[PDB]
A paper describes a structure:
The rotating flagellar filament primarily functions as a propeller, acting as an Archimedean screw, and supercoiling of the filament is essential as rotations of a straight filament do not generate thrust. Here, we show the atomic cryo-electron microscopy structures for flagellar filaments from enterohemorrhagic Escherichia coli O157:H7, enteropathogenic E. coli O127:H6, Achromobacter, and Sinorhizobium meliloti, where the outer domains dimerize or tetramerize to form either a sheath or a screw-like surface. A shared feature in all four structures is the formation of symmetrical homodimers between the outer domains of flagellin subunits, with one outer domain rotated 180° relative to the other. These symmetrical dimers are the result of outer domains being able to adopt either an “up” or “down” conformation.
Numbering used by the authors:
A (entry chain p): 294 to 342
B (entry chain F): 196 to 360, 376 to 488
C (entry chain e): 391 to 488
D (entry chain h): 489 to 537
E (entry chain h): 99 to 195
F (entry chain N): 148 to 195
G (entry chain e): 99 to 147
H (entry chain N): 50 to 98
Write the structure that this text describes.
Amino acid sequence: TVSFETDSAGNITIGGSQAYVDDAGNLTTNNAGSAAKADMKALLKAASE
Amino acid sequence: AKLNTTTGLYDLKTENTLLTTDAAFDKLGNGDKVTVGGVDYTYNAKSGDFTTTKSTAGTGVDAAAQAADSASKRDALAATLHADVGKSVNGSYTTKDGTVSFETDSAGNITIGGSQAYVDDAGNLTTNNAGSAAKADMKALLKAASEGSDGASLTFNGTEYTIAKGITYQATVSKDVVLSETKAAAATSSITFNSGVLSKTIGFTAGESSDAAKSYVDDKGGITNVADYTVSYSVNKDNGSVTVAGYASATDTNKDYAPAIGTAVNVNSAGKITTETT
Amino acid sequence: ETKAAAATSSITFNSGVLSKTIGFTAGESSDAAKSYVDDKGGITNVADYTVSYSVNKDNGSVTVAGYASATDTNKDYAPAIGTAVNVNSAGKITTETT
Amino acid sequence: SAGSATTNPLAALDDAISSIDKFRSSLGAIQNRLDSAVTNLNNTTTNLS
Amino acid sequence: ATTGTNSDSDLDSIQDEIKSRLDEIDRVSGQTQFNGVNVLAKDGSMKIQVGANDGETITIDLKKIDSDTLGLNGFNVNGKGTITNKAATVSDLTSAG
Amino acid sequence: VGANDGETITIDLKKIDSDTLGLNGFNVNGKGTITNKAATVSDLTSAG
Amino acid sequence: ATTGTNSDSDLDSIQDEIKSRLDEIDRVSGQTQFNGVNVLAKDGSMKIQ
Amino acid sequence: IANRFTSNIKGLTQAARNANDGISVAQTTEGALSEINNNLQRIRELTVQ
């Protein structure tokens, strides 16, 4: 389970810091492999795929 | 003093003790570098101990070498040292552009905010799992960081570890310990005395210097280049008084220990030889 | 004679134990050595150090964050990061508040 | 699960006061003996004169 | 202060006064001085020549009087004293290992 | 307090007013002021 | 003066008095004279037969 | 030794005067605090009403 603060116009923020979505679909606050795509649309697309 | 038959003078010879590890350690200063067994230690006077930089492993030059095995076993050893079963410890795991808190309790178990997190293929830390890629352990986290495309930085209670794109980290060893390895056997330990401007490297094997260097301490402490201390005394046959009639030294001595010629020789209160009247 | 002519002089500093030899051109050092003294006196052989300050735009507070050196420098002139910097009596930028 | 409050404050204070009183008594005795010495010195000086 | 009717604020005020007076004791001990000699800060002795020949001396013994030699260091009268600890449970039982 | 250097006693003072005791908008009847706040760049960014 | 209760004007007056007395010390040192010799203005020595 | 004793006596007398001034400061501040406390008590009574 992850609790995230969505911001205006679409953003992901965990613990006051910008959060990134993993390519496989997990949510993190640190980028790995130069794959951040810090957007809720990207999070939804990753979850769907 | 011995009488010189050919000249008739009295020559007094004083010996000088070779530099020892204890004296070198006493004279050790801030920023000094000690090389024993091929590993370099930096002395710290603030805490009075030697700081070291230890890489994980890597000796072979190709993939099919012992380098990978050594790296794996050193990673396992570090993870085992990170057990801390009795009490929990907090740290931070930082990627190239992001950071995350870390709170482990025992056996290298990753817990973030009271909920167990997991490590990904690229060392990413996520509270969730995609495809059952949990492997929530310190060993798995370290292996994923080592095999990851990008390096990471770990901050713990002790020193800060850096996983390169191998793990480089600082470590602390006691001066007494380092002394024990230096004096244990015929080691090639060398000490560099650095004043921040002036530097000299002394290489001594199991105590005394064997690098053809005249390092000695007996004069007043410290380091000196005088191998031998010999001075000639002339005894007046009529008066009976003793005067200094020059001196000779094995090394140059740069006339640093030169006493005045023709000055009366006096006996100190303790019984030594001294030119001071009072 | 060392300063006026374009000679190649050598100067040796000896403390009785520690020795250093520095080559000198006509007024400067050309021995591929750093040999800088301008900081406070003494030869500290550091080319230059750059200190990076982070400015907090919320209130305007300035702290120390980042040190760069063209030489090893042993972090001699590197203040600990995250320490609030102040202004000395003479207007210089300095970290202590005494 | 013993706490941090001092166990026997009155006993500790009594011990402190007793130590102070002993040291004061010692000083008083020394002062009396010194005054007696002064008187003896004056008498001896008069007789020697 | 030892009375149980007093509340936490009252105990805090009383202990503040106690700490102030202990500080006064320490200050007087440190600062009392005679002819450049701290009489109360050393555990030595003084010799007084009372005769006309050598050896005719009287010794005054001084004692180092302060908080340390009287105890009273953490005279924590505003503390908590004996407190009953809570019963164990399965959560911290497993946390213990 | 002493005759030599460093022999001092310190008296601590406190800034006592409405601000340090709260009570600013006591507002028993419900009509008063707050003097809300001064904005900052973080507030502007949050506002967009 | 070292007491912290004093204000700026009080410190100024006290330092004025201090400066006046230091000036007196200097004046006495400079002007003290015996037989045309400034006894306190020189670090020398005098020889008596 | 007489000079040292004179210096100590003068210093201690002046220190006693300084302590008296400090006591005066404390008394004035405490009177102001007492008046503030009375006002606060009356305000609390009004709130209860």
